[PDB]
Structure 1
Amino acid sequence: GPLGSRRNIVGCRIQHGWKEGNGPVTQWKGTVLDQVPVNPSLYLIKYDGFDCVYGLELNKDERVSALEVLPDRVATSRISDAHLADTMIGKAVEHMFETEDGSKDEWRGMVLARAPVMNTWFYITYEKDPVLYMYQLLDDYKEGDLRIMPSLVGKQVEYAKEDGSKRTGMVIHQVEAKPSVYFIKFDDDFHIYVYDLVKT
């Protein structure tokens, strides 16, 4: 049936309307990176112009409208420096970000993996902002903006909010290079959280 077998949307360009509340419908365009094995309704998408990877149930989320699967399967690119790319995986990093002033701020983070499909991009998360980001880190490294420093999957989670309520979600991925680190998807939001889970 539709989007089955060889028509699987992973690896494809998509576009769709996006609407929140009574706001206007806007067009989102992106590349589908992955389908979550423990929740096959859930896809991971890199949207043009959004630095965070989003998890959306593309066929179920009422905010999504007019979904189009484009005739455009994203080809792999050749990595500019294979040894450097492999070396970054699992490392702590300091990632430089320029701002309004032109002042440049250094954010401590961890390189998680090469991104699927968009294979010159890297999964990365930050100590101060523990969700899943995606950047072409070899470019940033070349420009002097990156310094390299020297099963729970499928389980329901409940995060203890300060107001006494519990935020529900699911563990969706275990980071191969650092298997104490997991991706968590909360039911109420599309960011992918990335945490080193400390047993307690």
Structure 2
Amino acid sequence: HGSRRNIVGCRIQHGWKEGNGPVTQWKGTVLDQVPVNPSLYLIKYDGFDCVYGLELNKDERVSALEVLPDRVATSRISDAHLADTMIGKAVEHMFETEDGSKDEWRGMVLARAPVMNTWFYITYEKDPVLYMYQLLDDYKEGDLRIMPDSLVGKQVEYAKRTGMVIHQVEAKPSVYFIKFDDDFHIYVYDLV
């Protein structure tokens, strides 16, 4: 009935059209495939640090999906001990604004990212979606300071809106990834 190759670990490009807007072009890297919903992929789009969830084969807003011949480089971590003990910790993450002023955001390092092995999954208190950064390099730069059964498959309802729990964070088993309807962000909540 039709068999194709898997796209996890591959870089892709596709067109995007929402509403009466024009078709825009995008490049990205497919990070993983959700077990409790294999149609849902986690993608890191070129030039942005949020991890997004899209059904790249069923979403009618997607067009001209192609797989690139690019091979994501398998670099070596410059500091395995720091990379290992940093996971699961609360952090202060320094960012830079327009005027050059510095914003500092409370976050938590969740895990090492797949496919891009020098990047880290991280979420923030005032922005609880899934982010990806090369945290070891910010740490050396001095912009990162470190501080001292599964619900996957269930649905969660919030009043601000329904989503599904798609992943349990290993280092913090009460923290889960949630994919909400009609929102391509991956939310990171503590479900207690």
Length-normalised TM-score, structure 2 = 0.95
Query: Deviation string for 1:89-147 (max 9, x for gaps)?
Result: 00000000000110011000000000000010000000111000101111111111100
Query: Deviation string for 1:2-33 (max 9, x for gaps)?
Result: xx999310000000011111122111111100
Question: Distance between the aligned counterparts of 2:161 and 2:4, measured in 1?
Answer: 36
Question: How far off its partner does 1:76 sit?
Answer: 1.9
Query: Deviation string for 1:54-108 (max 9, x for gaps)?
Result: 0000001111110001223424211111111101100000000000110011000
Alignment: residue pair count: 190
Query: Deviation string for 1:146-191 (max 9, x for gaps)?
Result: 001112101122212xxxxx81110000000000000000011100
Q: Which runs of 5+ in 1 are unaligned?
A: 161-165
Deviates more, 1:71-80 or 1:125-134: 71-80
1:106 aligns with 2:99: no
Question: Distance between the aligned counterparts of 1:140 and 1:121, measured in 2?
Answer: 11
Deviates more, 1:43-52 or 1:30-39: 43-52
Question: Distance between the aligned counterparts of 1:195 and 1:158, measured in 2?
Answer: 12
Change (3 A) 1:9 1:96: same
Deviates more, 1:62-71 or 1:106-115: 62-71
Deviates more, 1:18-27 or 1:102-111: 18-27
Q: Matched residue of 2:68: which SS?
A: strand
What are the within-5 Å matches in structure 2 for residues 85-100 of structure 1? 85-100=83-98
Q: Matched residue of 1:7: which SS?
A: coil
Question: Distance between the aligned counterparts of 1:88 and 1:50, measured in 2?
Answer: 23
Alignment match, 1:22: 20
Change (3 A) 1:49 1:156: same
Question: Distance between the aligned counterparts of 1:5 and 1:192, measured in 2?
Answer: 28
> Percent identity over the alignment?
100
Length-normalised TM-score, structure 1 = 0.91
Q: Considering only aligned residues, what root-mean-square deviation do their CA atoms show, in Å? A: 1.6
